[PDB]
Structures are given as structure tokens and as C-alpha cells.
Design a binder for this molecule. Structure first.
Ligand SMILES: O=[N+]([O-])c1cc(-n2nccn2)ccc1NCCCCCCN[C@H]1C[C@](O)(CO)[C@@H](O)[C@H](O)[C@H]1O
Ligand SMILES: [Ca+2]
Ligand SMILES: [Ca+2]
Lengths: 83, 850
């Protein structure tokens, strides 16, 4: 089955979900990367409140989530600080 | 107001020189004394009335340049010759006598085509390519050389003892066919220089002018004694290598422009740069004084400054404010209130008690800080810097041997003798992390007031008869004092890192050669629309003479800009090389998120455009560093035969690819954009509408408008993923914007490296890529095979303007099977978007449109 953008602008195979290229006008095909300018990344933050951050802050080298999951391939190792 | 500063009539040497009017020169060359040496022709000159004997040293140089030096034959004391400005001893070419009569000697440079005719009586020099007269020297008979005799002069309450009497030198040059001259910054005046006949000469004397005004020839903070002449047919340059107070007269007259230089002391030392194209002149001048230092990438981002951020908490609130309002910023600046009572290299113990902690917080956001360090040292026995300089005798001195003391920000202060190499070494070592306590690798430096500014001095600067290293007078060295400050600071930032990190130093005063040490800005402008406009001609005049890293305070330093003006200044500043918002102590806070949302949004858009274009900016600065070509350019540099561009200063080029016409009028509904070039097309980068040249296009604008056009035949690289600072972006993929020529072609370059070290030079760790489009194929190849770089940067997108819909798109890269790319096409705009090529930027590849 293919993935359909949440704004109906396109329908793409699921191999273009989180493929580090922006295919949906609302950014919904890249929830886990920095590829879309209007996307959002979800910090689960087990032990604190969950948080949403701009996609542009995924793997930017800066620790944005207390659980550190926004930095998974940047060279910055973020520690858990949700306490 | 201006009675504080000398007019030419109030400058005794300028009054004497300028009273010599065009006529029969009393100087004549003694052809019996002529000697052809290995590097130069020497011949004696004599004043017919005074019988004073001078020596002309004439040299042909490689790269089609001529050097003329004139000094006394038997001087009582040596005259000053400017050191440390030339990067090398210029390679010479051989001169030959190829013709002579009783009153003339014709010289050939090497084996042609350049020749120099030395006339004996009256003394005169003519420079020719074959039979075409390029330039004449002393044709109006204005040569003047006051020899050193066996005087006392007062201005306001200051007295110049002038112990060597009149020693000024001067010489005129004639430029047949030239009607347009440019250069000799810094002046708040038009790009095309005006004739000085009915008024003041242009003045070159580094001075601190409070609330300087526009459209006048008063000397400002910097002096680059380089004049460019442009016509439809040729380009020439004149480089007057003198560090003393200098006045420049410009007169017009079959069309011909005459230039006259008048300097207080030193020898006559002038380079003639014969082109023939303006890029030849750029190359010629760069071979003499060097090229623009390659800025660390972060310094091409946005700088947030004011006088002053209050404390560490304020700095961190500003930092967080950028992220909370989704605006990028690379550097926050600390003006003089961050130090202990304007004792530089210190921190206020209450408001900045933990500078390392503040710097660490900024580093965790991948941002930098700049701290101001001025060259005046508070006279204070508890101040270690002052004590060390006093004890080691490294201060500028007065004639009685005591250390000079003037007034500046900390009150009474002394001035280190930056002409002394031992002083510059001390200064550089002071920037070590052990000596400059509280500094860290992400702290960079701002040198201000280095004219030097002296509040109780004549014309707000140092006395002419202060004494420097080797006994030279301050009047001899004045215009390179700031350059020495800039140089020693930059070397300090390099040395503190063990020679690895590239520096960033902003300097206010400058001279020829200052491009080697960092950035400059146009000082204390004012929050007014005409000051916004004049930033273009001021930075263009600096660009033409090699200082490519130029800018003006965004928003204006003095007064409070209305929000519409501040928006327009951000849009203007986003497309100028040094991009810093700065403001006076008593202005309201104007961080860009403090405005209403519609103004915030327009400013954020300008910041995003700047950050997206960083790969383009960085490549233009690499080309400036390697070739000496200016980053920001007048239209006439790209269109030397279009006479209607010779005076344009409300428009500029970035490289050869982008034409910028920022809105610079309140309430504007449109702008008139001149799009030059026969057979040339231009693409509106916001609408993708193509326009043919040459034409004047009326473009409607709104508050968010920045009129920018990409030239057909160019390829512009962009980082389309704007992050919070450049450090966050420098591993991100590149989008290529291909603007097709009418012939279906385009080309561009891209430079990449680690972004902050000298490894590109010491280890050849960099990439230089050539992108080229022809037929229906886009190809990436190496423009320099010596460069290799480990980088994850890849090509995520190609945007082609002016293309039809292909049937299929095929990518080939070495090491990979042939791949098919999906694509999207807009028939209305003829824009083709190729999806995710996915190829490393280090790889050769080709994309074919079938
Ligand atoms: O007439 N005087 O020269 C004079 C004389 C006396 N005086 N007279 C007798 C005893 N004292 C006192 C003051 C003055 N000038 C006053 C005010 C000029 C403010 C402009 C400074 N701008 C630079 C400093 C820096 O402001 C801050 O580091 C930056 O922010 C900018 O960027 C820099 O360009
Ligand atoms: Ca995708
Ligand atoms: Ca992050």
C-alpha cells in the first residue's frame, strides 16, 4: 500500500516515507528527518512531557529533546535530562 | 561640527601643493646619469631652480605593471617607505632602450607590447601598448617633491612641532579616454567619483567622524589609495603606496581624466596596473597586496549586535529568542560594556562573571561570540596589560621620550606602537587561552577605534609628531596603524589554536592589504533611508580595491529606524558580504522578533534567503581568495561596454550570477530594475519569470519583496534546509538552481571544506566542483583534482529554469548503475524540478534529460 499525504497533495510509495527528501506539501512524509521545511519531529520523552520540534532541528547537532532522540546521526551524543 | 576637521586650505602641505597649478614643470631628467640595472632603470632628476637632485627608479613588472619610485639623491635623513603592505617583492621584467633622441628615451618592457617614453625636459613619462597611449605621468607639470631641509603648525589647540619641516610629495597622472574613475575609499560618496575642481580634494586619512554625513569627500575611518579607471575600451588602475595623509584631485577635460595625489611625507611610490580588462587589474593588484582572507563559514552568516547587551543572562535570552522565533543567527556580539571599565581583555565582574560558561552555552547552540578589543590601553597601574606595555617600552612615545597619553573610552589611555613587530608579537600572544582568560575557541574579535581615535587629539586622532619604532613620526605611518592592529589580532586568533583555526576579525580602520586580515564595516551610519542607499556605493568602492568582506550596520547605528526601514535594511544586508545588525547605546532594542508579525515575517524571509545562499557566498569568497575577484560587483564590471551601467549604484551583482535591486524607499510600490546584456536572459527567482536584456523593468514590490534575478547561463548552489546557524547546516545536501542561457547552457562552481580551518591549504582537504549544462545534460566534474574531502553532502534536488518537459531523466555516476529520477514540470514557468539525485557531492555524475 502507498502512503498518502495528510493534505491530499500526492500519494507516494512507503519507500518515500522518511527517505530524507520532502515529498508532501505539509511535510507529513518525513516525520523522522530534517527534510521538510514545515515538518515536525515528536519527542516521546518518557519521564517528562512529550514535545514537538521543528524538523530543521533533527540532527542539527543541538540537543532539543530531553530524551535526546532528535540527534541520532549528527555526531552529537545527547544525554537524557527529562528529570 | 566640521570645523573639527581640516579642509585642504587648513592643511599646510595640501595648501602648498594645491597652489601649484598646471604648467611647465621645473623638473628635468639628466639622461647622462641614466643606468639600466638588472631590475630597474635609474636616472637623476633635478629641479631647474632649486638644483635639488632626485632619483627616479623605473621598473617594468611581470603581469603588465609599471612601478615608479622617486626619492632624494642625497637625503639628510631617510624617507619612509611603506612596509608590510606588499605581500612579496614584485617580479620584474627587463627594460630595454628601443629608441632615443636628445630629449627622449623610449623603453620596451621585455619584448613588448608595452613601452615607456621618458622625456627629459620637461620630465614626463608616457605609457603605451604598441602605439596606443595609455597613461601619462606629470603631463600637467604638477610633480612636487619638498626635500628635507635643516614648520611649527597649530590647529585648534593642538600644536604640531613638525621637526623636519615641509616634506610633502605629489604627482599627476593623465588618463586619455577615461571619463569614469572609482575607488579611494573610504568616503560617504557616490561610486563614480566626482571631479574635485570646484571644491575639496578627496582626503585619505583614517579619522573618526562623529555622525558623518553623506555626499562629501571628508576622510572617514579607512584609506585605500587605489583608483580604477574604466571606459568602453580599457581598464586601468593606479596604486599610490603612501601611508601619510593624502589628498586626491580629480579633473576632467578627446575625453580625459587627470588624477593628482598629494601626500605629507614618504617617497613617491606608485604602481600602474595596465589591465586591459578590469579582471586583469584585479589580478594585478592582488599580486601586489594579496587577496581576501577566506572567512570561516560562520562569519558569512547573520551577526546580532548592539551597544550593549547587559550581562550573560541577556546574551542567553537573545540566543534563545532567535530559536523561539525561528530565525537563524551565527554570532552574538559583546561591545565595550562587557569589559571591566573598558579595560580590554577583561570581563565585568558583576555582569560577566563566568565567560567560559556563557561561551559553553553558545557552543551547545553551535553559535559564536565576538568580543570587542580596542588598541587604547587604560593608564592604570592595576591593569596588567598597561603594566606590561609600560615596562617593556612598547607604547607610542612623544618627542621627550615619555609614553603618549590621550583620552578615549576608559579615560586617560596610552597607545601601543603597532608598527613595532615586537609589539604585534606581544599582542598576538595575548590572545592565547592562558593570557586572555575567559576566552574560548568560539570567541572572536572586533577591533574598533584603531584609526587610532584619540578624543582630545587633533582631528580626534594622534598627534603628527608622536614617535614610533625606528624613530618614524606618526605622520609617516598613520594610515597603516589600524591595519597593524587588524593584522596582529588575526595572527593572535590563528596562533592561539596552534595555527589551525581561521580567524575572524572585524576592523574599522584599514589600508591596502587589510583584505588579508578579515572584514570591515562603514562605521557609525544613521537610521535613515539615504544611509541605507549609500551602503551599496560604499561597499562597492571597497570591493573594487580588494576589500570584499564589507558591510554597514543593519538598521543604522544612530537613532531608531521605523519598522519598514528596518525590514528594508535586513533585505539589503542579507545580500551584502558582512551582515551585522548593530545599534547605539541609547537606541531602543531592535532584535528582529520585537516587531509586529508582518515585519518579523519579512525579516525572517530575508534571513532564510541569506542562509540558503551560504554555499554560493562561500564559493564567491573562495574565488576572491584564490583570484582576487570581488564578491559584490558593480554592473559595469560584468558589462564593461554598456555605458549606461558606469554610474549605477542602486543595483549590484554577486559574482556573475545574481543581480540585486533592494527596495530603498519608504512606501515603495515598485522598483526600476535595469537588466543588462545583449542576448542575455534574467530569471526572477521568486516568480521564475524570464526577462530578456537589455531593458529597464518596472517590478511591483510588497514589504516582503527582495528583487533578485539569476542570470541565464549560471548555476547557483543552495542549502534549502535552513537551520539555526551555519554550523548546523554544513553537512546538509545541496540544491542546484540551473538558469539556462538562450543557447540552453549553464555553468557554476562550488567550494566545500570543513568550514573553519586552514586544512584546505595545508592538507588540500576541500572540494571544488564544476557543474555544467549543455545540450540536455548536467555534468558534475572536478574543477581542482588536488582537493579531496570526507563529507556527507549530497545533491538532493536540481531546479532548472527555462527547460521543457523531458520524457525521462537518467542519472549516471561512477560506481553506480544507471538510475531513473522522477521529476515535476510547470508548463507556465518552464521550471523543471529533478527529485533526489542522491549522489555525493564528491562524485562525478551526469543527468540526462531525454
Ligand atoms: O568629539 N569626540 O570624539 C568625543 C569627545 C569626548 N571628549 N571630549 C573631551 C573629553 N572627552 C567624548 C566623547 C566624544 N564622542 C562621543 C560619542 C561617540 C559615539 C560613537 C562611537 N562609535 C564606536 C564606538 C562603539 O560605539 C562602542 O564600542 C561602537 O558601538 C561603534 O560601532 C563604534 O563605531
Ligand atoms: Ca519523502
Ligand atoms: Ca536537535
Amino acid at each position: 500500500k502507498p502512503f498518502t499525504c495528510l493534505d491530499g497533495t500526492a500519494t507516494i510509495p512507503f519507500d518515500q516515507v522518511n527517505d530524507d527528501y520532502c515529498d508532501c506539501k505539509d511535510g507529513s512524509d518525513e516525520p523522522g528527518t530534517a527534510a521538510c521545511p514545515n515538518g515536525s519531529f515528536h519527542c516521546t520523552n518518557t519521564g517528562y512531557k512529550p514535545l514537538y520540534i521543528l524538523s530543521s532541528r533533527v540532527n542539527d547537532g543541538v540537543c532539543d529533546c530531553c530524551d535526546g532522540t532528535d540527534e541520532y546521526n549528527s555526531g552529537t551524543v545527547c544525554e537524557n535530562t527529562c528529570r | 561640527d566640521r570645523s573639527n576637521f581640516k579642509t585642504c586650505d587648513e592643511s599646510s602641505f595640501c595648501k602648498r601643493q594645491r597652489s601649484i597649478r598646471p604648467g611647465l614643470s621645473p623638473y628635468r631628467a639628466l639622461l647622462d646619469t641614466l643606468q639600466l640595472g638588472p631590475d630597474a632603470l635609474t636616472v637623476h632628476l633635478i629641479h631647474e631652480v632649486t638644483k635639488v637632485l632626485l632619483v627616479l627608479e623605473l621598473q617594468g613588472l611581470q603581469k603588465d605593471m609599471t612601478r615608479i619610485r622617486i626619492d632624494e639623491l642625497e637625503p639628510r635623513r631617510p624617507r619612509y617607505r611603506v612596509p608590510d603592505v606588499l605581500v612579496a617583492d614584485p617580479p620584474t621584467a627587463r627594460l630595454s632602450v628601443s629608441g632615443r633622441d636628445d630629449n627622449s628615451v623610449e623603453l620596451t618592457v621585455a619584448e613588448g607590447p608595452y613601452k615607456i617614453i621618458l622625456t627629459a625636459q620637461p620630465f614626463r613619462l608616457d605609457l603605451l601598448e604598441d602605439r596606443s597611449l595609455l597613461l601619462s605621468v606629470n603631463a600637467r607639470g604638477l610633480m612636487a617633491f619638498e626635500h628635507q631641509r635643516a614648520w611649527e603648525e597649530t590647529f585648534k589647540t593642538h600644536s604640531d612641532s613638525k621637526p623636519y619641516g615641509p616634506t610633502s610629495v605629489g604627482l599627476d597622472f593623465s588618463l586619455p579616454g577615461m571619463e569614469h574613475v572609482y575607488g579611494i575609499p573610504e568616503h560617504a560618496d557616490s561610486l563614480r567619483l566626482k571631479v574635485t575642481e570646484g571644491g575639496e580634494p578627496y582626503r585619505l586619512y583614517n579619522l573618526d567622524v562623529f555622525q558623518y554625513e553623506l555626499n562629501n569627500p571628508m576622510a572617514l575611518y579607512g584609506s585605500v589609495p587605489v583608483l580604477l579607471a574604466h571606459s568602453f575600451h580599457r581598464d586601468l588602475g593606479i596604486f599610490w603606496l603612501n601611508a601619510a595623509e593624502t589628498w586626491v584631485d580629480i579633473s576632467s577635460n578627446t575625453p580625459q581624466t587627470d588624477i593628482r595625489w598629494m601626500s605629507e611625507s614618504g617617497i613617491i611610490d606608485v604602481f600602474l596596473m595596465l589591465g586591459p580588462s578590469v579582471f586583469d587589474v584585479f589580478r594585478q593588484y592582488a599580486s601586489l597586496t594579496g587577496t581576501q582572507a577566506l572567512p570561516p563559514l560562520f562569519s558569512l552568516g547573520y551577526h546580532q549586535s548592539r551597544w550593549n547587551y547587559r550581562d550573560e543572562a541577556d546574551v542567553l535570552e537573545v540566543d534563545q529568542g532567535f530559536d523561539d522565533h525561528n530565525m537563524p543567527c551565527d554570532v552574538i556580539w559583546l561591545d565595550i560594556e562587557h569589559a571591566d571599565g573598558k579595560r580590554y581583555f577583561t570581563w565585568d565582574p558583576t555582569r560577566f562573571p563566568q565567560p567560559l560558561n556563557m561561551l559553553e552555552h553558545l557552543a551547545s547552540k553551535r553559535r559564536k561570540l565576538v568580543a570587542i578589543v580596542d588598541p587604547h590601553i587604560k593608564v592604570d597601574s592595576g591593569y596588567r596589560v598597561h603594566e606590561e606595555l609600560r615596562n617593556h617600552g612598547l607604547y607610542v612615545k612623544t618627542r621627550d621620550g615619555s609614553d603618549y597619553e590621550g583620552w578615549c573610552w576608559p579615560g586617560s589611555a596610552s597607545y601601543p606602537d603597532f608598527t613595532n613587530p615586537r609589539m604585534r608579537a606581544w599582542w598576538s600572544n595575548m590572545f592565547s587561552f592562558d593570557n586572555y582568560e575567559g576566552s574560548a575557541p568560539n570567541l572572536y574579535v572586533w577591533n574598533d577605534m584603531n584609526e587610532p581615535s584619540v578624543f582630545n587629539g587633533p582631528e580626534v586622532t594622534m598627534l603628527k609628531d608622536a614617535v614610533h619604532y625606528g624613530g618614524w613620526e606618526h605622520r609617516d605611518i598613520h594610515n597603516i596603524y589600524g591595519l597593524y592592529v587588524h593584522m596582529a589580532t588575526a595572527d593572535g586568533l590563528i596562533q592561539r589554536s596552534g595555527g589551525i583555526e581561521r580567524p575572524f576579525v572585524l576592523s574599522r580602520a584599514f589600508f591596502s592589504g587589510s583584505q588579508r586580515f578579515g572584514a570591515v564595516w562603514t562605521g557609525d551610519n544613521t537610521a535613515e533611508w539615504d544611509h541605507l542607499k549609500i551602503s551599496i556605493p560604499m561597499c562597492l568602492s571597497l570591493a573594487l580595491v580588494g576589500l570584499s568582506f564589507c558591510g554597514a550596520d543593519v538598521g543604522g547605528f544612530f537613532k531608531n529606524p521605523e519598522p519598514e526601514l528596518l525590514v528594508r535594511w535586513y533585505q539589503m544586508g542579507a545580500y551584502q558580504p558582512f551582515f551585522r545588525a548593530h545599534a547605539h547605546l541609547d537606541t531602543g532594542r531592535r532584535e528582529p522578533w520585537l516587531l509586529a508579525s508582518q515585519y518579523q515575517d519579512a525579516i525572517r524571509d530575508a534571513l532564510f534567503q541569506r542562509y540558503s545562499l551560504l554555499p554560493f557566498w562561500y564559493t564567491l569568497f573562495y574565488q576572491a581568495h584564490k583570484e582576487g575577484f570581488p564578491v559584490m560587483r558593480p554592473l559595469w564590471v560584468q558589462y564593461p561596454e554598456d555605458m549606461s551601467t558606469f554610474s549605477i549604484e542602486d543595483q549590484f551583482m554577486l559574482g556573475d550570477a545574481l543581480l540585486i535591486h533592494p527596495v530603498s524607499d519608504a512606501g515603495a510600490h515598485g522598483v526600476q530594475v535595469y537588466l543588462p546584456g545583449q542576448e542575455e536572459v534574467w530569471y526572477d527567482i521568486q516568480s521564475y519569470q524570464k526577462h530578456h536584456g537589455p531593458q529597464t523593468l518596472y517590478l511591483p514590490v510588497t514589504l516582503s519583496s527582495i528583487p533578485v534575478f539569476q542570470r541565464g547561463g549560471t548555476i547557483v548552489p543552495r542549502w534549502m534546509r535552513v537551520r539555526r546557524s551555519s554550523d548546523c547546516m554544513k553537512d546538509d545536501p545541496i540544491t542546484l538552481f540551473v538558469a539556462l542561457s538562450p543557447q540552453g547552457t549553464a555553468q557554476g562552481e562550488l567550494f566545500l571544506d570543513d568550514g573553519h580551518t586552514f586544512n584546505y591549504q595545508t592538507r588540500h582537504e576541500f572540494l571544488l566542483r564544476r557543474f555544467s549544462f549543455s545540450g540536455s545534460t548536467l555534468v558534475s566534474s572536478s574543477a581542482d583534482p588536488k582537493g579531496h574531502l570526507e563529507t556527507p553532502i549530497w545533491i538532493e534536488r536540481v531546479v532548472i529554469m527555462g527547460a521543457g518537459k523531458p520524457a525521462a531523466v537518467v542519472l549516471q555516476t561512477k560506481g553506480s548503475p544507471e538510475s531513473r529520477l522522477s521529476f515535476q514540470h510547470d508548463p507556465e514557468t518552464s521550471v523543471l524540478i529533478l527529485r533526489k539525485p542522491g549522489v555525493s557531492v564528491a562524485s562525478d555524475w551526469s543527468i540526462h534529460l531525454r
